Amino acid sequence: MNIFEMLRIDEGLRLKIYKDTEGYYTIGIGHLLTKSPSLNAAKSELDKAIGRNTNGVITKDEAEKLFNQDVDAAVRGILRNAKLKPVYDSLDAVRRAALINMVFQKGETGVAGFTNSLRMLQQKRWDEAAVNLAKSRWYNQTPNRAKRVITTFRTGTWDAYK
Ligand SMILES: [Cl-]
């Protein structure tokens, strides 16, 4: 199991533009196009991201490309965030995947904000962190996914995903 498989599970795959849990225009593997309410804008954005006139639809391959670029970026934002870096650096491999998941789903910034639980992860306070992480808008809006991640942070294993 690894990052890609993980996220692929959490985010699914759609070849046609859709609205996410928050109602935003998204595509492929959790690839967010826009916060705006215009399907057109979303279309523009897509074309631009794909490099062509898509008409709201893309190929699997394209979807995948987006995905790598996205995983890549997530990591990098992590590597560039003065708050994230240290944490990540101190984590074992499995757990990093978890931090990356969150970052992918909510943004560096978003994540950069879980100060306390980040602190907890740093000191390796698994159980406390999990509780902490649970008290969030994030958990409350996407309970099942949040659970997987949290479990993940908690045990250092892929069971949540098995
Ligand atoms: Cl969920």
**Which domain CATH number covers 147?**
1.10.530.40
H or E element in which residue 138 lies: helix 137-141
Question: Burial level of 104, CB count in 10 A (0-12/13-18/19+)?
Answer: buried
Please tell me the total count of domains within the chain: 1
- Spatial strand order in the sheet of 14-19: 14-19, 25-28, 31-34
Determine the distance separating the centroid of ligand 1 and the alpha carbon of 101, expressed in angstroms: 13
Tokens for 141, please give them: 């809006």
Declared resolution, Å: 2.5
Determine the distance separating the centroid of ligand 1 and the alpha carbon of 82, expressed in angstroms: 29
Binding site per annotation, positions? 32, 104, 117, 132
124: alpha, beta or left? (left if phi > 0; alpha if psi -120 to 50): left
Catalytic site includes residue 70: no
Determine the distance separating the centroid of ligand 1 and the alpha carbon of 24, expressed in angstroms: 16
Helix spans in 19-59 (H):
39-50
Catalytic site includes residue 11: yes
41: alpha, beta or left? (left if phi > 0; alpha if psi -120 to 50): alpha
Residue 143's identity, in one-letter code, is: P
Distance of CA 134 to the CA centre of its chain: 16
Method for structure elucidation: X-ray
Range of the domain at 30: 1-162
Which is catalytic among the residues 11, 45, 70, 108? 11
3-state helix, strand, coil in the chain (%, to 5): 65, 10, 25
Sign of the four-CA dihedral 91, 96, 102, 107: positive
The set of residues, in sequence order, having a beta carbon less than 8 Å from that of 144 and lying 6+ positions away, is: none
Please name which of 115, 120, 122, 123 lies closest in space to residue 131, comparing C-alpha atoms.
Answer: 120
Determine the distance separating the centroid of ligand 1 and the alpha carbon of 52, expressed in angstroms: 33
Alpha carbon distance 39, 46 (integer Å):
10
